[PDB]
Design a protein around this ligand. Sequence first.
Ligand SMILES: Cc1ccccc1NC(=O)c1ccc(C)c(C(N)=O)c1
Ligand SMILES: [Zn+2]
Length: 139
Amino acid sequence: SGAIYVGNYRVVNRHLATHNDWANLVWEDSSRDLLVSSTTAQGCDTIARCDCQTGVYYCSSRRKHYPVSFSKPSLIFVEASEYYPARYQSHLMLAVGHSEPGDCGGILRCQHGVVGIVSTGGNGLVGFADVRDLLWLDE
Ligand SMILES: Cc1ccccc1NC(=O)c1ccc(C)c(C(N)=O)c1
Ligand SMILES: [Zn+2]
């Protein structure tokens, strides 16, 4: 689990979105595993606006943060999960690292702010859904 709170927006993994997220929907993209809902309370997280390929992510299955090198956002084939088929996921970044299903939502940060959230795993790789291209999140 996990979310990003910026301005009057909440960014979550689309497969973990709640009824309240869907009832206050702003934007969702099934190919990216992202959903953004509106909030009444103001958030104060900052989204990174950069091309960093190094950062640190939170791994809830180890109660630890890990420094990683990750690939630029791209269209990657990902295997089937418990309730969803195998497909190409877009705007995905991969790194060598540990990730279990419940780790989804853990934030990847660089010196400029939030880069993305854990979205995929398997074969000793962790994949993060990028949010740096969503410039509207800060306006
Ligand atoms: C994070 C992880 C680690 C190890 C093994 C599997 C996972 N993946 C998931 O739990 C997961 C579940 C549901 C969906 C829709 C997606 C996705 N991004 O398409 C990923
Ligand atoms: Zn950066």
